[PDB]
């Protein structure tokens, strides 16, 4: 199975033990590591961070002792702006310039492929997205025609039904992509005004779901039936949780909230907590297993956070294997306990290793 893991270039700036650099990654942990994110300037793919060239090398160095490890560079990301991506993909000239600039850039920096993270095409860009993927793959095939190891092309896609229906032509793009990472998390925003797990495996209590489509199982099934081959589908599993600030004594699923949770010490983003930060949070907290959804939430004081742990990722892997999917995708390596000192056990990347062991099990 494929174990696609993301590394974010901004995790380096986190205070203390939160700072994560590529060299802190286990070269034998994943089968694919994706660097996030590359920018696009003057219609050319380009670096984002001032020291990306250095970090690129730091990441690719991992391949020296592990020749089977593949690496990809992701372009886009939530903070990229679908608007900019649209202008480039819709304009015939800009699209060509961009596509042509990718192979040289990837070979120059030691990458094995490109990951498209356009979040997200609009109803207006559905076809453009298809064309972009189709032509990019063409260029990759051409660039390797002489006899090179062809560059890989993947895409991180939304797991939301509304976005999927308006942005993607699953059947068409599935043919050109080497693999699709479905982002099966972020299913329950603080805006919804109630507590909810952002990455449940199944819908669960039919009574307590704000919507039947907001769960991992529905997204996987839906995409499969839309025409994405199981052998090309990689299921996303989060190593971070979504938090809320409770508004009353109620602490169950669907309880009243006043907004996102208090920012984590290292990630410093209201509504988000890295797994290592959750392990701290767990001290003195109560953990509940959501029956039906197969995932846990933890609550303490006026805080509540839905996340994934060793037990739940194991179940999710069991699920993807039963569905004969290509494997799992992890977002992100730097949100797992990479130091291995927060969740005790001294084990590094506890959630990602749990996923790896589960994929090899049976
Ligand atoms: C079911 C449904 O459609 N719900 C909608 C939500 O999907 C949507 O929320 C966005 O969901 C995206 C995935 O579909 C998120 O993008 C990926 O996932 C991570 C984590 O959420 C993103 O965030 C990371 O990267 C940004 C920079 O780009 C960084 O600033 C953040 O700190 C970082 N977050 C964490 C915790 O690591 C990535 O950009 C991206 N990764 C990949 C694989 O490409 C997106 O972040 C998320 N938006 C937000 C801000 O929550 C919401 C949006 O309103 O709408 C629902 O309807
Ligand atoms: C990614 O590339 C874009 C170029 O397309 C950069 O955006 C430009 O930023 C400068 C300075 O902030 C502005 O003067 C330009 O108007 C922007 N170009 C436009 C119109 O898109 C962007 O800064 C790059 N990202 C990073 C952080 O390096």
Residues 232 and 92 in one domain: yes
Tally the C-alpha atoms within 13 A of residue 65's C-alpha that lie toward its C-beta: 9
CATH number assigned to the domain comprising residue 50? 3.20.20.80
With the most atoms of ligand 2 within 8 angstroms of its CB, the residue from 9, 39, 53, 83 to mutate is 39
Calpha distance 163→78 (Å, rounded): 14
Residues 85 and 53 in one domain: yes
Residues 136 and 218 in one domain: yes
* Ramachandran assignment for 220, one of left (phi > 0), alpha (psi -120 to 50 degrees), beta (any other): alpha
Cα-based angle 316, 182, 270 (whole degrees, multiple of 5): 85
Residues 125 and 85 in one domain: yes
One-character DSSP codes across 172-187: HHHHH-SEEEEE----
Calpha distance 72→30 (Å, rounded): 12
- Structural domain for 300, as ranges: 239-308
Which residue bears the tokens 């959750």?
A: 278
Residues 215 and 286 in one domain: no
User: Is 76 part of any known ligand binding site?
Assistant: yes
Residues 12 and 156 in one domain: yes
User: Is 297 part of any known ligand binding site?
Assistant: no
Minimum-distance ligand to the CA of 216?
A: 1
Residue 56 CB-density burial (10 A; 0-12 exposed, 13-18 middle, 19+ buried): buried
Residues 300 and 176 in one domain: no
1: CA distance to ligand 2 center in Å?
Answer: 38
Burial readout 167-185 (b: 16 or more C-beta within 10 A, e: otherwise): bbebebbbebbbbbbbbbb
Closest residue by Cα to residue 107 from 65, 146, 56: 56
Angle separating helix axes 310-322 and 350-360, nearest 10 degrees:
30
Residues 234 and 331 in one domain: yes
| 19, 213, 216, 265, 307 from 14: Cα distances, Å | 4, 35, 30, 9, 21
Tokens for 69, please give them.
């490890």
Residues 81 and 8 in one domain: yes
User: Is 79 part of any known ligand binding site?
Assistant: yes
Instruction: Tell me how many domains the chain contains.
Output: 2
Peptide bond just before 242 cis, omega within 30 deg:
no
Calpha distance 345→351 (Å, rounded): 12
> Final residue of a domain: which of 276, 291, 308?
308
Calpha distance 333→203 (Å, rounded): 27
Calpha distance 199→205 (Å, rounded): 15
Residues 282 and 257 in one domain: yes
Residue 226 three-state SS: helix
**163 touches ligand 2 (CB under 6 Å):** no
Task: Read off φ and ψ for residue 214, nearest 5 degrees.
Answer: -80, 60
User: Is 113 part of any known ligand binding site?
Assistant: no
Residues 143 and 59 in one domain: yes
39: CA distance to ligand 2 center in Å?
Answer: 9
With the most atoms of ligand 1 within 8 angstroms of its CB, the residue from 121, 186, 238, 272 to mutate is 186
> Final residue of a domain: which of 290, 308, 326?
308
**187 touches ligand 1 (CB under 6 Å):** yes
Task: Read off φ and ψ for residue 29, nearest 5 degrees.
Answer: -65, -55
Which method resolved this structure? Answer: X-ray
Residues 134 and 264 in one domain: no
Resolution of this deposited model, Å: 2.2
Q: Residue with the nearest Cα to atom 22 of ligand 1?
A: 78
> In terms of DSSP H, where are the helices of 114-230?
126-144, 161-167, 170-176, 216-226
> Final residue of a domain: which of 308, 327, 342?
308
For residues 21 and 348, the answer to whether their CB atoms sit within 8 Å is no
CATH number assigned to the domain comprising residue 248? 3.10.50.10
């Amino acid at each position: 199975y494929k174990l696609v893991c993301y590394y974010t270039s901004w995790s380096q700036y986190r205070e203390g033990d939160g700072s994560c650099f590529p060299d802190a990654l286990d070269r034998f942990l994943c089968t694919h590591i994706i660097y996030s994110f590359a920018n696009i300037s003057n219609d050319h793919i380009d670096t984002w961070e001032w020291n990306d060239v250095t970090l690129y090398g730091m990441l690719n160095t991992l391949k020296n002792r592990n020749p089977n490890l593949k690496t990809l560079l992701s372009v886009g990301g939530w903070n990229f702006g679908s608007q900019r991506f649209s202008k480039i993909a819709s304009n015939t000239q800009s699209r060509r310039t961009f596509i042509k600039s990718v192979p040289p850039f990837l070979r120059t920096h030691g990458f094995d492929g490109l990951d498209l993270a356009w979040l997200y095409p609009g109803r207006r860009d559905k076809q453009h997205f298809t064309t972009l993927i189709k032509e990019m793959k063409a260029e990759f095939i051409k660039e390797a025609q002489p006899g090179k190891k062809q560059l890989l092309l993947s895409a991180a896609l939304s797991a939301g039904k509304v976005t999927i229906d308006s942005s993607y032509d699953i059947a068409k793009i599935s043919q050109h992509l080497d693999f699709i990472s479905i982002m099966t998390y972020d299913f329950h925003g603080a805006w919804r005004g109630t507590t909810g797990h952002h990455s449940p495996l199944f819908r669960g209590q039919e009574d307590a779901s704000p919507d039947r489509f907001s769960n991992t199982d529905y997204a996987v099934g839906y995409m499969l039936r839309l025409g994405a081959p199981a052998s090309k589908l990689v299921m996303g599993i989060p190593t971070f949780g979504r938090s809320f600030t409770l508004a009353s004594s109620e602490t169950g699923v669907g309880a009243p909230i006043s907004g996102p949770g208090i920012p984590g010490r290292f990630t410093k983003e209201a509504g988000t907590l890295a797994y290592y930060e959750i392990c701290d949070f767990l001290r003195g907290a109560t953990v509940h297993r959501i029956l039906g959804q197969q995932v846990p939430y933890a609550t303490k004081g006026n805080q509540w956070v839905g996340y994934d742990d060793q037990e739940s990722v194991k179940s999710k892997v069991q699920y993807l294997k039963d569905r004969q999917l290509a494997g799992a995708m992890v977002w992100a390596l730097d949100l797992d306990d990479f130091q291995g000192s927060f969740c005790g056990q001294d084990l590094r990347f506890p959630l990602t290793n749990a996923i790896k062991d589960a994929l090899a099990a049976t």
